[PDB]
Ligand binder design. Sequence first.
Ligand code: ATP
Ligand code: ZN
Length: 64
Amino acid sequence: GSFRVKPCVVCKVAPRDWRVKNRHLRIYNMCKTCFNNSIKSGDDTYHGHVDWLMYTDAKEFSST
Ligand SMILES: Nc1ncnc2c1ncn2[C@@H]1O[C@H](COP(=O)(O)OP(=O)(O)OP(=O)(O)O)[C@@H](O)[C@H]1O
Ligand SMILES: [Zn+2]
């Protein structure tokens, strides 16, 4: 069933919104709902996304 992926937690009912970046796939650390809420609750946390390339995977969390 599950693997090594990491789904949302604020909802635990959703994986994590995703977007497409030129040949690459962009995932988010929080779903669209919790994402907006993250702005509320999170304000400045859990803010992170993962980009997948047609060859390698990447992470872009703590950017500051
Ligand atoms: N739902 C989310 N969950 C967690 N973090 C998010 C979420 N959405 C945005 N972020 C944070 O804000 C940034 C994402 O904004 P994003 O870069 O995807 O807009 P963009 O339009 O795709 O960028 P660009 O304009 O260069 O294409 C990331 O650094 C990420 O950490
Ligand atoms: Zn969520």
